[model samples]
Target: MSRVQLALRVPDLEASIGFYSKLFGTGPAKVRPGYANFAIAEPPLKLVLIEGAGEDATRLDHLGVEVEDSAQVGHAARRLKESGLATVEENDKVWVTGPGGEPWEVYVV
Candidate 1:
């Protein structure tokens, strides 16, 4: 399914998980060392939590759009590059930085 993904860098993992679980009324779907993700049903959101950032670190690590396949990821990157934007190609995704320096990820599962 296509959905927006929000990757956040949090100082405290458990605390962040607790807060988000209460806020969203659901616990994380997967929890790993220094990482966790929530599959939020109501908003169809993919919320990822990454640990080890400092308290002063930016809360938002990056934003992403999950696509159906790798072809869509490549297509999006090509379109962005054609429009004069720079894209960084990864294994299953492409990253494009916005004018405001926000990194946007177009990815496939």
Candidate 2:
């Protein structure tokens, strides 16, 4: 299954996790020292929280689309390039820069 992913830069991972856990009524799927992620099933979202980026807690780290496998990632890369969008390949992810300079990643997990 494919789902939209949002990586948000937060000042406090625990606080954000708490808020989202309550909001989504589910706990984080993984928790690290400075990172946490919630796999929300209701709306099929992959929510990532990265801590201690800066003062702005609402800052977005990046946006992503989760795919089933690396094949799709490569396919997306080709399509992106053919469509005149530049893309960067890193591991299992393909990254593209939006017109607003925001980064978008298509990845397999």
Candidate 3:
């Protein structure tokens, strides 16, 4: 009943877009000079790729995970921690994975 999109910063938009297009089994819904978006059907998710700038710019900026209930956020956080992925705990905020890693945040609004 809800949809979420994750926007990620990549060093090379073309390469990242191509990789995700294949990974998601879908081409970009919209493509611009430095932006790309793909829609997923299986789980009804959207993946966005954007070019990065500045010294602090990151390749993998963040992640957006959709949940049916707010409680699922905690569950997912636990799973990520158990999987050995770095996680930052914050109330009502989806866990922010470590730097140079995927940024995962739960969407439960």
Candidate 4:
């Protein structure tokens, strides 16, 4: 599992996806109409992009940590609650935020 993840919102998903595919010399590991993610081992990067934001926008959708163990997800969620930050959970996924309120996610895979 990748320890670090980055997500972005872009004005053009197809264009961005194509660029990344060529840049990495491979297609996205996962793809949907409005979203695509590239999990690259070359430089240990998990890059994601989505459509619907202005091209000039910051558009940093979120960050993530992937845990291979389900127990780690629960531990992280409990710690999030114990820290007094609000959280939302959906099945094997949990959502939280950074100290400055940047969106973050933890998922058990």
Candidate 5:
């Protein structure tokens, strides 16, 4: 299985960690200054929280999803584009933001 992880740059590490811990119904697997990681077992997802730097420090930063195949990446890109969301072509990945203003990246191995 692919190691799928998503990292988010948050404003308050402690508060965010607590919030996620309750939301996910589990505490963080590991935590350090400006960082926290949660290993979600049920869905096999990994969520990380990191304090951002520079421009990323003030913004919402980015989110990501890992796909099992390269073809899934292309399909995701096309589907997101068709939904009228603006997308950025980054390397072999596609980044888009939905109505909720959360940035998302879809990529594959």
Candidate 6:
């Protein structure tokens, strides 16, 4: 099992949190001064919202995949290494570079 993660930077953190909470029918699983994230169940996704000034309000932050099993981490490492994609392999985490040099963080729950 796996989940897609979308990190986004919004103009208003509280407003974005409220909107997503209403849309997803739940509150964020984790919250901080400038960030909040929801572990969505129905669609197996992680929606992360961050508030800041340096980035554009509408720009996407990044994308990722959360792997459910440790074995899946090894499996991913082999697959990525075989395909010649550069990866930073941790015990149960791997990072991949997306097209145009964006980094994708693949990690455990």
Which candidate achieves the best TM-score against the true structure? 2
Q: What TM-score would candidate 6 get against the native? A: 0.88
Ranking by TM-score: 2, 6, 1, 4, 5, 3
lDDT of 6 at 102: 74
Every candidate's lDDT: 0.90, 0.92, 0.73, 0.83, 0.77, 0.87
Model 1 residue 104 distance off true place after TM-score fit, in angstroms: 1.2
How does candidate 1 score on lDDT? 0.90
Overall local distance difference test of candidate 2? 0.92
What's the C-alpha lDDT at position 26 in model 4? Answer: 88
Q: Tens-digit lDDT track for model 3 on 30-72? A: 9989888887886688777888754254455567776777677
Candidate 6 per-residue lDDT, tens place, 1-109, comes to 7899999988888989999999999999999999999999988899999896655565688888888887888888889889999899876788898879777877777
Query: Model 6 misses residue 10 by how many Å?
Result: 1.8
Question: Model 1: clashing residue pairs?
Answer: none
Clashes of 6: 0
Model 2 misplaced stretches (Cα beyond 4 Å): none
Specify the highest-lDDT model's number. Answer: 2
* Worst 10 contiguous positions by lDDT, candidate 1: 52-61
Candidate 2 lDDT by residue in tens digits, 1-109: 8899999998878789999999999999999889999998889999999897566647988999999999999999999999999999997999999999899999999
Candidate 1 Cα deviation (angstroms), residue 16? 0.9
The sequence of per-residue lDDT tens digits that candidate 1 reaches over residues 77-100 is 899899988899997999988888
Clashing pairs in 2: none
lDDT by residue (18-44, candidate 4, tens digit) is 999999898999998888999888777
Model 1, residue 109: what's the lDDT? Answer: 74
